[PDB]
Design an enzyme around this catalytic site. Structure first.
Site, mmCIF file in Angstrom:
data_model
loop_
_atom_site.group_PDB
_atom_site.id
_atom_site.type_symbol
_atom_site.label_atom_id
_atom_site.label_comp_id
_atom_site.label_asym_id
_atom_site.label_seq_id
_atom_site.Cartn_x
_atom_site.Cartn_y
_atom_site.Cartn_z
ATOM 1 N N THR A 128 -8.435 6.046 -1.830
ATOM 2 C CA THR A 128 -10.174 6.147 -1.692
ATOM 3 C C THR A 128 -11.036 7.229 -1.346
ATOM 4 O OG1 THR A 128 -9.862 5.614 0.248
ATOM 5 C CG2 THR A 128 -9.398 3.872 -0.921
ATOM 6 N N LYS A 144 -8.404 13.992 4.946
ATOM 7 C CA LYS A 144 -7.782 13.125 4.378
ATOM 8 C C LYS A 144 -6.659 13.247 5.194
ATOM 9 C CE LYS A 144 -6.432 14.310 0.135
ATOM 10 N NZ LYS A 144 -6.721 12.986 -0.588
ATOM 11 N N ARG A 145 -6.222 12.288 5.925
ATOM 12 C CA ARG A 145 -4.314 12.894 7.157
ATOM 13 C C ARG A 145 -3.923 13.822 6.702
ATOM 14 N NH1 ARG A 145 -4.101 8.847 11.314
ATOM 15 N NH2 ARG A 145 -2.211 10.187 11.248
ATOM 16 N N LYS A 200 0.392 14.492 0.829
ATOM 17 C CA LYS A 200 -0.784 15.238 0.168
ATOM 18 C C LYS A 200 -1.208 16.516 0.161
ATOM 19 C CE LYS A 200 -3.295 11.021 3.072
ATOM 20 N NZ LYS A 200 -3.813 10.623 1.713
ATOM 21 N N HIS A 238 0.724 -1.217 0.053
ATOM 22 C CA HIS A 238 0.541 -0.205 -0.519
ATOM 23 C C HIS A 238 1.195 1.486 0.246
ATOM 24 C CE1 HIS A 238 -3.555 -1.942 1.323
ATOM 25 N NE2 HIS A 238 -3.094 -2.968 1.503
ATOM 26 N N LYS A 297 -15.044 8.188 -3.025
ATOM 27 C CA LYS A 297 -16.352 8.790 -2.520
ATOM 28 C C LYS A 297 -16.909 10.016 -2.507
ATOM 29 C CE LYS A 297 -14.138 6.762 1.264
ATOM 30 N NZ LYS A 297 -13.065 7.496 2.990
HETATM 31 O O1 LIG Z 1 2.202 2.338 10.386
HETATM 32 N N1 LIG Z 1 1.144 2.593 10.246
HETATM 33 O O2 LIG Z 1 0.404 2.504 10.831
HETATM 34 C C1 LIG Z 1 0.816 2.247 9.250
HETATM 35 C C2 LIG Z 1 1.577 2.045 8.312
HETATM 36 C C3 LIG Z 1 1.139 2.545 7.162
HETATM 37 C C4 LIG Z 1 -0.305 3.047 6.759
HETATM 38 C C5 LIG Z 1 -0.528 3.129 4.690
HETATM 39 N N2 LIG Z 1 0.321 2.181 3.847
HETATM 40 N N3 LIG Z 1 -0.670 3.601 2.546
HETATM 41 C C6 LIG Z 1 -1.839 3.370 3.197
HETATM 42 C C7 LIG Z 1 -3.188 4.099 2.039
HETATM 43 O O3 LIG Z 1 -3.422 2.974 1.668
HETATM 44 C C8 LIG Z 1 -5.036 3.270 1.335
HETATM 45 C C9 LIG Z 1 -5.770 1.671 0.661
HETATM 46 O O4 LIG Z 1 -4.864 0.945 -0.402
HETATM 47 C C10 LIG Z 1 -4.602 3.959 -0.471
HETATM 48 O O5 LIG Z 1 -5.484 4.260 -0.969
HETATM 49 C C11 LIG Z 1 -3.536 4.850 0.725
HETATM 50 O O6 LIG Z 1 -2.608 5.789 -1.486
HETATM 51 C C12 LIG Z 1 -2.404 4.582 1.283
HETATM 52 O O7 LIG Z 1 -1.460 5.522 1.336
HETATM 53 N N4 LIG Z 1 -1.777 3.406 4.325
HETATM 54 C C13 LIG Z 1 -1.349 2.575 7.633
HETATM 55 C C14 LIG Z 1 -1.143 2.754 8.452
HETATM 56 C C1 LIG Z 2 -11.902 7.288 3.021
HETATM 57 C C2 LIG Z 2 -10.957 7.836 4.519
HETATM 58 C C3 LIG Z 2 -9.748 8.355 4.191
HETATM 59 C C4 LIG Z 2 -8.903 7.713 2.908
HETATM 60 O O1 LIG Z 2 -8.824 8.884 2.027
HETATM 61 P P1 LIG Z 2 -7.458 9.148 0.843
HETATM 62 O O2 LIG Z 2 -7.915 10.904 0.322
HETATM 63 O O3 LIG Z 2 -7.713 8.866 0.025
HETATM 64 O O4 LIG Z 2 -6.524 9.619 1.667
HETATM 65 C C5 LIG Z 2 -9.295 8.640 4.963
HETATM 66 N N1 LIG Z 2 -9.608 8.933 6.691
HETATM 67 C C6 LIG Z 2 -11.699 8.273 6.609
HETATM 68 C C7 LIG Z 2 -12.103 9.224 7.649
HETATM 69 C C8 LIG Z 2 -12.147 7.709 5.238
HETATM 70 O O5 LIG Z 2 -13.256 8.006 5.482
#
Ligand SMILES: O=[N+](O)c1ccc(-c2n[nH]c([C@@H]3O[C@H](CO)[C@@H](O)[C@H](O)[C@H]3O)n2)cc1
Ligand SMILES: *Cc1c(COP(=O)(O)O)cnc(C)c1O
Ligand SMILES: O=c1[nH]cnc2c1ncn2[C@@H]1O[C@@H](COP(=O)(O)O)[C@@H](O)[C@H]1O
Length: 809
Positions: A649, A541-542, A547, A350, A653
């Site tokens: 994602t 988003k975060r 971003k 991811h 939405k």
């Molecule tokens: O250690 N941790 O708590 C984490 C480490 C990595 C993630 C993470 N990698 N990619 C995404 C996201 O995955 C999403 C789902 O595939 C993607 O849509 C998005 O682009 C991507 O940035 N999250 C999360 C938590």
């Molecule tokens: C869908 C969603 C995300 C992911 O949004 P991105 O714009 O793809 O990073 C993050 N947080 C919440 C609460 C969501 O519903």
């Protein structure tokens, strides 16, 4: 009232009312005279839960009898949100419950707002897991989600003086009516200890034991009577733990801390011991459950009856744990065990950001999991023997591909472990899966090209259309029926209404209603005052440098400065909304939040601006807030530097809910533009190839500062204290970063972004053509259903056929 919410039959309504009163009295122990709205919420939740139970029992019975191949989705995160409405939608009970509650003098919408989000994830990865569970149930797959029941989920965000403050998310305080504790299926998990070699193989001895207690939550499919299970583990100390007396009992917390709190790091790796314990805890408990269920029907058939999907590398210890169990406990020879393991496991990647990749120090694994470290070394030696045979003499390739990284601190690269031990590796959008093959996993792709796949992400249309935007769902259903809710490709039929005056009017009316409803939510809960005729420009988003919330900030200031220069010129009014949580230790993300609120402090109080420009920081962005703001949005900001957002994602939405997108050609934005047509998307900025060309000659931000007067003005305003009069140097870290060490090339996309934003504004002035473009987006959003994503995993990875067949009710 509306058709997609189901029937309100007299018999059903009478029975719901009776059971509501039964739960209020017997379950909650309240009379109507002292019941609060919260008591009413719980009485309704218990009433709806009773309808799940029969279906849950009979679904799990059906799997025991038919013995289908079982799919185990392992994740450290499941970002579920609220359950009440989703349950009603999936069981076709929404209108009946609405009527039942109405006849009791209660407003169901008000009761729904009392429920806490289950916030057991950080953002996109956790929310993807939740959408996937919904799709697997809807497609009739014998699927189980396995994770950790964190006592504290993602923190609640408060903004104090423009700064993020964190508060614990005590989501279980009032109880969780959706889970069922199963203390009878508690299992032991081992830590520390040492390895003894006998004549009978290796033995892992002198370990500390923590118990894993499961809690089960039902996952209803869409109107098919299938209810699957999400099983979440909680840590418990054994009763002889540490057993002066009082202190020994108090020290039980050391074991129970494993499941206490979710690590709040989106796209970042923090190599802490507690996190490693969490990762092993979930894997060790889950694998025992899997093996138990397999034995209750010889391990050659294991991969025919079991699929394990690893959600990133976080559960990667499943690979050496499976080997441990098969070799040390079941006494399979190594080669047979490895065959079984590889055929069972599959890995989804991811992210490609280097700071997000898990690389665990060897000394941690050596102390905590000494047998697993031995198994990892053996995997590595056997794997590198294959590499050397395929590419003889290529010593550098051996170093690059090793599971063990050399350095002052030796580390295990968990992504390399996952590739070695999985029969399938996938990325999460086409451009991302290509990047994996061309860059970070190129060597692995050359050795085993057959392993590498793409599975573009998706979102569930139950939560993200029907639940959060019933007005839009209904006007679509009036034209093309209800079948689209479980077959989203049917939205393509809407292209034949793009010139229909009544449909154009209804689409625009629904958006307007959603904007009014959101504007009123803002006034009531946060004492803020927005113009609902303005263009709603939303980035939620975060908070992360990649971003590029900062690029949005630069545009906002540009608009402000243009108004101040020519105050009597017409501009399309905007409400710019930015929301998201920063990880607590991520200083630059916290500074970005402060900048956004500081811009708002100037812009929102300038009388010359009027209501032409408002900048709002949306506090505590979470799933329940996404359900409110996304239906209200006009413009979706998806502006990551090309090559950094693996998929996204949120993008999907917004597309489904009638916003247009301004975005770079990154992640799934590429595929969204392809489906809708590039003419129906606001594309700007560097492509991946342009980023690479800039990196080769060297990014010099000063060049953009020197050539673009509007950009220079903004940087001078930031530097000199225009947005922080009391603390003039407050933003110097942001300025220094943008000018001298910006990894994400904010200035390089500035000019194209501002120009593209001018085209957005121009189109917004012609509401008929804006709405026609919206229809073209909604109509082509079908590919982005998680039902599509899951059918692809099922057929191309797991080897199982999806089904839309109903179980009996
Ligand atoms: O250690 N941790 O708590 C984490 C480490 C990595 C993630 C993470 N990698 N990619 C995404 C996201 O995955 C999403 C789902 O595939 C993607 O849509 C998005 O682009 C991507 O940035 N999250 C999360 C938590
Ligand atoms: C869908 C969603 C995300 C992911 O949004 P991105 O714009 O793809 O990073 C993050 N947080 C919440 C609460 C969501 O519903
Ligand atoms: O020995 C058995 N007899 C009858 N049903 C069983 C038996 N073992 C498991 N099951 C069924 O499958 C179980 C599902 O839970 P599991 O054991 O976690 O898969 C039970 O709820 C039963 O419906």
């Amino acid at each position: 009232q509306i058709s997609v919410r189901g029937l309100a039959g007299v018999e059903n309504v009478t029975e719901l009312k009776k059971n509501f009163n039964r739960h209020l009295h017997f379950t909650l122990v309240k009379d109507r005279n002292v019941a609060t709205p919260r008591d009413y919420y719980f009485a309704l939740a218990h009433t709806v839960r009773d309808h799940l139970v029969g279906r849950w029992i009979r679904t799990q019975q059906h799997y025991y009898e038919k013995d289908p191949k079982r799919i185990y989705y392992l994740s450290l995160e499941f970002y579920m949100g609220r359950t009440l409405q989703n349950t009603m939608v999936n069981l076709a009970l929404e209108n009946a419950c609405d009527e039942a509650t109405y006849q009791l003098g209660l407003d169901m919408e008000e009761l729904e707002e009392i429920e806490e989000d289950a916030g057991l994830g950080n953002g996109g990865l956790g929310r993807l897991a939740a959408c996937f569970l919904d799709s697997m149930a809807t497609l009739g797959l014998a699927a189980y989600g396995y994770g950790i029941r964190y006592e504290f989920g993602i923190f609640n965000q408060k903004i104090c003086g423009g700064w993020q403050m964190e508060e614990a998310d005590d989501w279980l305080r009032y109880g969780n009516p959706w889970e069922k504790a199963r203390p009878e299926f508690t299992l032991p998990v081992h830590f520390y200890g040492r390895v003894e070699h006998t004549s009978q193989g290796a033995k892992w001895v002198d370990t500390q034991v923590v118990l894993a207690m499961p809690y089960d939550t039902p996952v209803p499919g869409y109107r098919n009577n299938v209810v699957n299970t999400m099983r979440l583990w909680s840590a418990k100390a054994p009763n002889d733990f540490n057993l002066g007396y009082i202190q020994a009992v108090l020290d039980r917390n050391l074991a129970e801390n494993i499941s206490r709190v979710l690590y709040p790091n989106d796209n970042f790796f923090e190599g802490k011991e507690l996190r490693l314990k969490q990762e092993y805890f979930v894997v060790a408990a889950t694998l025992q459950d899997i093996i138990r269920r397999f034995k209750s029907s010889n391990f050659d058939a294991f991969p025919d009856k079991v699929a394990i999907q690893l959600n990133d590398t976080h559960p990667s210890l499943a690979i050496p744990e499976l080997m441990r169990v098969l070799v040390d406990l079941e006494r399979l020879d190594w080669d047979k065990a490895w065959e079984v393991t590889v055929k069972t496991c599959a890995y989804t990647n991811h992210t490609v950001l280097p700071e997000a990749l898990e690389r665990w120090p060897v000394h941690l694994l050596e102390t905590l999991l000494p047998r697993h470290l031995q198994i990892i070394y053996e995997i590595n030696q056997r794997f590198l023997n294959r590499v050397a045979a395929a590419f003889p003499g290529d010593v550098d390739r051996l170093r690059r591909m090793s599971l063990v990284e050399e350095g002052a601190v030796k580390r295990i690269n968990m992504a390399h472990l996952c590739i070695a031990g999985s029969h399938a590796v996938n990325g999460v959008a086409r451009i991302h899966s290509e990047i994996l093959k061309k860059t970070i996993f190129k060597d692995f792709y050359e050795l085993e090209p057959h392993k590498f796949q793409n599975k573009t992400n998706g979102i569930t249309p139950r939560r993200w259309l029907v639940l959060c935007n019933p007005g839009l769902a209904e006007i679509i259903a009036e034209r093309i029926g209800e079948e689209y809710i479980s077959d989203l490709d049917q939205l393509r039929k809407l292209l034949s209404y793009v010139d229909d005056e009544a449909f154009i009017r209804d689409v625009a009316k629904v958006k307007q209603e959603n904007k009014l409803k959101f504007a009123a939510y803002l006034e009531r809960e946060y004492k803020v005052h927005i113009n609902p005729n303005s263009l709603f420009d939303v980035q939620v988003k975060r908070i992360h440098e990649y971003k590029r919330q900062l690029l949005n900030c630069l545009h906002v200031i540009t608009l402000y400065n243009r108004i101040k220069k020519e105050p009597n010129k017409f501009v399309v009014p905007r409400t710019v909304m930015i929301g998201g949580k920063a990880a607590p230790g991520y200083h630059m993300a916290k500074m970005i939040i402060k900048l956004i609120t500081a811009i708002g402090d100037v812009v929102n109080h300038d009388p010359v601006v009027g209501d032409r420009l408002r900048v709002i920081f949306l506090e505590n962005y979470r799933v329940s807030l996404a359900e409110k703001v996304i239906p209200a949005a006009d413009l979706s900001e998806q502006i990551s530097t090309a090559g950094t957002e693996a998929s996204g994602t949120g993008n999907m939405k917004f597309m489904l809910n009638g916003a247009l997108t301004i975005g770079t050609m990154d992640g799934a934005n590429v595929e969204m533009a392809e489906e809708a047509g590039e003419e129906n998307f606001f594309i700007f900025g560097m492509r991946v190839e342009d980023v690479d060309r800039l990196d080769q000659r060297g990014y010099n931000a000063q060049e953009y500062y020197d050539r673009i007067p509007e950009l220079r003005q903004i940087i001078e305003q930031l530097s000199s204290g225009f947005f922080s009069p009391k603390q003039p140097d407050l933003f110097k870290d942001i300025v220094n970063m943008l000018m001298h060490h910006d990894r994400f090339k904010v200035f390089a996309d500035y000019e194209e972004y501002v120009k593209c934003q001018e085209r957005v504004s121009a189109l917004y002035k012609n509401p008929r053509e804006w709405t026609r473009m919206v229809i073209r987006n909604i109509a082509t959003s079908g590919k982005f259903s998680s039902d599509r994503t899951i059918a692809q995993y099922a057929r191309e990875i797991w080897g199982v056929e999806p089904s839309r067949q109903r179980l009996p009710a």
